[PDB]
Design a protein around this ligand. Structure first.
Ligand SMILES: CCCCCC(C)=O
Ligand SMILES: [Cl-]
Ligand SMILES: [Cl-]
Length: 152
């Protein structure tokens, strides 16, 4: 992966977890990406999220860890993530593990360079989720949600 090539603007399209509450409407992980800035040994993210019906911003910096390809960031506990698949100019898929109180759950995210992606790419993401034990019912199509696009 040439991580520089993931720099720039992105939109959150599909959001999936094995702990569904975390990505439901008031969940901590129901966040909508606006950009990823690639720095020397980190990735700087800007998100939106909805809190009590109002759009709000979250900025996070993830550091490279000792494992190649892996990044870590503190947000509602301790997260580690990797990039699973990308073509840089259309889609990117992330896999994240959150730890809190010694318990874990997975998040998978499909982002697009535009506000939607075609059915083929979405279906591929769905099968990758399932490969990770994230069942179809636990994958949310954020294009049918408030993604705070107007705050962008
Ligand atoms: C929301 C905490 C993790 C942020 C970075 C990713 C991969 O979404
Ligand atoms: Cl939550
Ligand atoms: Cl929206």
């Amino acid at each position: 992966l040439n991580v520089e090539k993931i720099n720039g603007e992105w939109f959150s399209i599909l959001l999936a977890s094995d702990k569904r509450e975390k990505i439901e409407e008031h969940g901590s992980m129901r966040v909508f990406v606006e950009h990823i800035h690639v720095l020397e040994n980190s990735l700087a993210f800007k998100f939106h999220t909805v809190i009590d019906g109002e759009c709000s911003e979250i900025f996070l910096v993830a550091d490279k860890t000792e494992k190649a390809g892996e990044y870590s960031v503190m947000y509602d506990g301790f997260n580690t993530f990797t990039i699973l698949k990308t073509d840089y100019d259309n889609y990117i898929m992330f896999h994240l593990i959150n730890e809190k109180d010694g318990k874990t759950f997975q998040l998978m995210e499909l982002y697009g360079r535009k506000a939607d992606l075609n059915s083929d790419i979405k279906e591929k993401f769905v099968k990758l989720c399932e490969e990770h034990g994230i069942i179809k019912e636990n994958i949310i199509d954020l294009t049918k949600t408030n993604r705070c696009l107007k705050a962008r």
